[PDB]
């Protein structure tokens, strides 16, 4: 999963 | 909050600038605190160089209590290129922080050359002097030599600031030598100086020119003229023969001139009366002096009857009223007869509910014709504050067109109003006044300095100071928090919790009082009487209660303050119970205690959160407004119990929330409205005039029912 802050 | 933090790190990474780092440190402070103070101190050790950055760092150090000053001082020394913009920033930033003490320090850097800025520096030495008797002489001497450095002075404002550092004997020599035409400010000071210095030959000459050649007609100046005259030897006749015209000022001066030459007063007193009995000012003027026996010895003119009755101090005046009950003259004027009717009503007030209700009918009756009589309106509000008729005061208040600064001096008339959403909105709007006036006075102080108006700057400064933390400001916040939590609405609740958390230093200090307890007494003698039921200490305690409810780190400090205040409180029996309940409830929920301490405090809450105990909140006179005022406070307490059981859930809190479920039905069975209706229905009035009692009875009954029931439905 990547993450929100991106 | 947390998305702001990730945003700030993004920014700091990109910079990898100063203003962003500061903002991040501030967030870390909010989230947390020592971490942030370290970060800020680290940032201060690095040479702050940007204006906005340096401004934010100074505000951070003011928040956490001498490092804010040292942010700007560093920047000023290390980059003198910008020293003026840095100083002006510091100045504006200091006015907004109500930090008036630092002014001299800013002005010193900013002077080390503009002439206006020298004036600022000098003026600031006066402002310091208006606080430390050990350094008085040095400050006075410093500002004095600053102003001598600027001679010749160019205007009366410069001259004014010079006088701030001069003795009375220096002031007279300076002003006698001024080439510029003096303003009124300085003329008064010149005369003050000459009177204090017994320079009477000079005084008499100066006043003669003003009064006679200039036809100034100033009573204060007239008094200095006859005083200077006797001292330089002139006789009664030489002065009196110069007093021809029958102006109001000269007529009264003849009395003052008789007094000064120990001559007999009666002829001058009778001459004034015969010339001014047709004017409403007559009584206030002659009441200044010791009027002779014989003059009290002594119609087609109402104002003459008014005066004469006031001279004889006549308490019953209803005869005159039916002669002149009909409003005549200009629409917007008042009926002078009601100077006497109001006198009779105030003398008849005896704080018993029947007398209150009777005098309400009378006041309402007189306002039917004297639509704009403000004193009747204020007294009518005062009588309504004695009962549970809580929704009847706001209409009178708004009809007076109370607005802006008047709220600060008069909003206490609304002390007993009911917690309706309509009133909440009115209260929020009063708060809007405080917000806007806060900004306007700050900008007016800045601009007063940018122009050269030292004549009025101390007034501006003190005006701001007196509004920063007044009981009227805090009562407004207490009210908004109370009504907000009583209803279900929270549109502004979070805003004002933030005000408390941001201003704890103010909240726990002594509040300034600018309230007007004088205006309803204008042209009467202030006897002891009924009062609007204010409770300033409770206002503080309430704000402390909410401050503690929403304390997230450590509630012990605020609770010591709370306990110190309640311990000296002077409360009634129920108010004492109520803040002990708050004490025990707050400490259970907001402080770490061991299982035994907790059970102890819980059992006190358990013992007394019962109607049989809280029944003591009900006054013996059921028609007293203490009833709803206490009820309101009980409702607010219960809401705070329920809020805390959510914020800090526990089995104990669950038992208290259950304990308070039956209160509503139980107090409803005390039949508080019915009993009040029964008392009113059994009152016999013989009013001193023909008035319809029934509509006031019907209005009062309906207002009592509506207000009590709304509180009872809130339990």
């Amino acid at each position: 999963m990547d993450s929100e802050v991106a | 909050y947390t998305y702001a933090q990730s945003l700030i790190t993004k920014k700091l990474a990109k910079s990898p600038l100063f203003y962003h780092v500061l903002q991040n440190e501030i967030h870390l402070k909010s989230g947390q605190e020592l971490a942030i103070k370290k970060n800020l101190e680290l940032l201060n050790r690095y040479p702050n160089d940007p204006l906005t950055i340096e401004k934010l760092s100074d505000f951070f150090s003011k928040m956490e209590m001498k490092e804010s000053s040292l942010v700007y001082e560093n920047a000023i020394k290390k980059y003198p290129v910008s020293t003026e913009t840095l100083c002006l920033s510091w100045f504006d930033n200091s006015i907004e922080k109500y930090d008036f003490k630092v002014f001299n320090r800013i002005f010193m850097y900013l002077n080390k050359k503009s002439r206006l800025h020298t004036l600022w520096y000098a003026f600031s030495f006066h402002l310091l002097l208006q606080e430390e008797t050990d350094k008085a002489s040095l400050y006075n001497s410093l500002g004095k030599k600053l102003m001598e450095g600027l001679q010749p002075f160019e205007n009366t404002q410069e001259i004014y600031v010079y006088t701030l550092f001069l003795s009375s004997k220096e002031i007279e020599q300076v002003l006698s030598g001024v080439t510029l035409p003096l303003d009124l400010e300085l003329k008064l000071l010149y005369m003050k100086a000459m009177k204090e210095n017994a320079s009477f030959e000079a005084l008499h000459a100066y006043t003669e020119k003003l009064l006679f050649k200039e036809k100034f007609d100033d009573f204060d100046t007239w008094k200095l003229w006859i005083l200077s005259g006797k001292e330089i030897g002139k006789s009664f006749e030489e002065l009196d023969q110069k007093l021809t015209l029958p102006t109001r000022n000269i007529s009264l001066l003849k009395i003052e001139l008789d007094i000064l030459y120990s001559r007999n007063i009666e002829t001058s007193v009778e001459n004034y009366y015969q010339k001014f009995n047709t004017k409403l000012c007559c009584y206030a003027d002659l009441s200044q002096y010791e009027l002779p026996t014989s003059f009290i010895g002594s119609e087609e003119n109402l104002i003459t009857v008014v005066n004469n009755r006031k001279f004889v101090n006549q308490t019953d005046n209803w005869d005159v009223y039916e002669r002149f009950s009909t409003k005549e003259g200009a629409e917007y004027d008042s009926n002078p007869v009601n100077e006497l009717t109001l006198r009779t009503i105030v003398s008849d007030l005896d704080s018993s509910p029947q007398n209150t209700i009777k005098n309400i009918v009378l006041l309402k009756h007189l306002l039917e014709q004297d639509k704009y009589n403000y004193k009747l309106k204020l007294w009518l509000m005062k009588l309504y504050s004695q009962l549970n008729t809580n929704d009847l005061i706001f209409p009178i208040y708004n009809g007076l067109k109370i607005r802006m600064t008047q709220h600060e001096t008069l909003n206490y008339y609304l002390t007993t109003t009911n917690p309706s959403k309509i009133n909440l909105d009115a209260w929020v709007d009063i708060y809007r006044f405080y917000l806007t006036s806060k900004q306007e006075i700050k900008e007016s102080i800045i601009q007063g300095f940018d122009n050269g108006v030292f004549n009025k700057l101390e007034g501006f400064i003190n005006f701001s100071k007196r509004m920063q933390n007044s009981i009227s400001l805090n009562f407004t916040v207490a009210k908004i928090l109370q009504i907000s939590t009583i209803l279900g609405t929270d549109g502004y609740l979070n805003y004002f919790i933030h005000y408390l958390k941001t201003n704890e230093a103010l909240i726990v200090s002594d509040y300034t009082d600018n309230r007007d307890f004088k205006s309803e007494w204008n042209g009467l003698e202030k006897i002891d009487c009924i009062d609007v039921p204010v409770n300033d200490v409770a206002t503080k305690l309430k704000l402390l209660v909410y401050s503690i409810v929403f304390e997230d780190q450590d509630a012990s400090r605020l609770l010591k303050v709370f306990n110190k205040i309640t311990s000296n409180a002077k409360f009634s029996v129920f108010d004492n119970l109520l803040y002990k309940l708050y004490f025990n409830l707050l400490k259970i929920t907001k402080t770490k205690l061991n299982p035994q301490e907790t059970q102890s405090l819980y059992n006190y809450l358990q013992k007394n959160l019962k109607t049989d105990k809280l029944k003591i909140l009900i006054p013996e006179n059921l028609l007293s407004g203490e009833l709803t005022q206490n009820l309101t406070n009980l409702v607010e307490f219960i809401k705070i119990v329920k809020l805390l059981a959510k914020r800090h859930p526990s089995s104990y809190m669950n038992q208290l929330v259950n304990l308070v479920k039956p209160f509503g039905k139980e107090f409803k069975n005390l039949k508080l409205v019915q009993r009040q209706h029964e008392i009113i229905d059994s009152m016999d009035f013989e009013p001193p005039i023909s008035v319809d009692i029934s509509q006031t009875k019907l209005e009062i009954k309906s207002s009592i029912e509506d207000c009590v029931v709304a509180l009872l439905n809130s339990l």
Binding site: - | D218, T247, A330, Q406
Partner: protein, 179 residues
């Protein structure tokens, strides 16, 4: 009785004068701005006994001399009810004509409620003439027909010429008075 300069803190004690129905209570901004920009044209009358405020004059200077419109304006006069009918408001308005700063201007301006009987009597005796009727000047609703006059909200702009029209029927709207 005695006249003293106005200072901002006097607002805290002006209620007996400013609760009168024809006396407006302005923003802190407004009072202070006058004290900043025309400090000698804001002054008060005090009582004999305690220095109780009897009334005040709040005035300004405004306008372009090239446009013949450089004048002194009265934004507020009022006398405490106890001290009326004894020359006091006249003393306040005439003392204004005496100041050098006012003498420098061409005329004295003021608005008065059409329904305000005593204010009109005051300026009539002082030598003021009705220069124009300002339509809705004191009213909330901003209106476009100058002929929809309304005595409860309209104003008479009064002028008195100083040493340096002939209709009460010129209807003008508030936003055409610019200076």
């Amino acid at each position: 009785t005695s006249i003293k300069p106005f200072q901002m803190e006097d607002l805290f004690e002006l209620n007996p004068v400013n609760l009168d129905p024809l006396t407006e209570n302005f923003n802190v901004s407004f009072y202070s701005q006058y004290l900043i920009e025309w400090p000698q044209l804001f002054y008060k009358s005090v009582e004999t006994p305690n220095g109780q405020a009897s009334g005040y004059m709040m005035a300004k200077t405004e306008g372009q001399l090239s446009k013949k419109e450089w004048h002194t304006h009265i934004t507020a006069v009022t006398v405490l009810d106890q001290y009326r009918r004894i020359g006091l408001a006249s003393k306040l308005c005439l003392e204004l004509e005496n100041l050098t700063q006012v003498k420098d201007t061409l005329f004295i301006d003021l608005f008065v409620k059409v329904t305000n009987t005593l204010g009109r009597i005051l300026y009539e005796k002082l030598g003021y003439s009705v220069f124009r009727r300002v339509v809705g000047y004191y009213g909330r609703e901003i209106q476009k027909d100058r002929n929809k006059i309304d005595d409860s909200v309209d104003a008479f702009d009064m002028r008195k010429l100083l040493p340096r029209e002939n209709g009460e029927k010129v209807y003008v709207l508030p936003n055409e008075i610019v200076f």
